[PDB]
Ligand binder design. Structure first.
Ligand SMILES: *C(=O)/C=C/c1ccc(O)cc1
Length: 125
């Protein structure tokens, strides 16, 4: 696979500029968002967790379109606050339940190293 653990302290360095192929080798779901929440990258593990087809969701807005169950203070609010501050590093459990069997996950959102983009990492719990 790719040898990176969920929640690693330097994950943003390890995944910096990772192409879509390499991202598909992670053991956990990985989504890269711009500051508005548009999907830039979406890996295979995430698609397995959620059922979404990665290439279909890239370019969509995660909060508006793909994941309305995350359009809440508890998820989007945290994301939006992090984007506004230009800093984000949070881990929390959540349940994904839009047009899918409800699935509890652990989420790690972390600002990407460079630029202004934001990772959403997901694993099952
Ligand atoms: C709630 O609507 C959650 C949906 C969802 C979460 C994560 C994804 O990668 C895709 C859909």
């Amino acid at each position: 696979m790719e040898h990176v653990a969920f929640g690693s302290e330097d994950i943003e360095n390890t995944l910096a500029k990772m192409d879509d192929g390499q991202l598909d080798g992670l053991a956990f779901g990985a989504i890269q968002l711009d500051g508005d929440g548009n999907i830039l990258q979406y890996n295979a593990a995430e698609g397995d967790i959620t059922g979404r087809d990665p290439k279909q969701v890239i370019g969509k807005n995660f909060f508006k379109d793909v994941a309305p169950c995350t359009d809440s203070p508890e998820f989007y609010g945290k994301f939006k606050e992090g984007v506004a501050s230009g800093n984000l590093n949070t881990m929390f459990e959540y349940t994904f339940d839009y047009q899918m069997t409800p699935t509890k996950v652990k989420v790690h959102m972390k600002k990407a190293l460079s630029g202004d983009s934001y990772w959403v990492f997901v694993k099952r719990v």
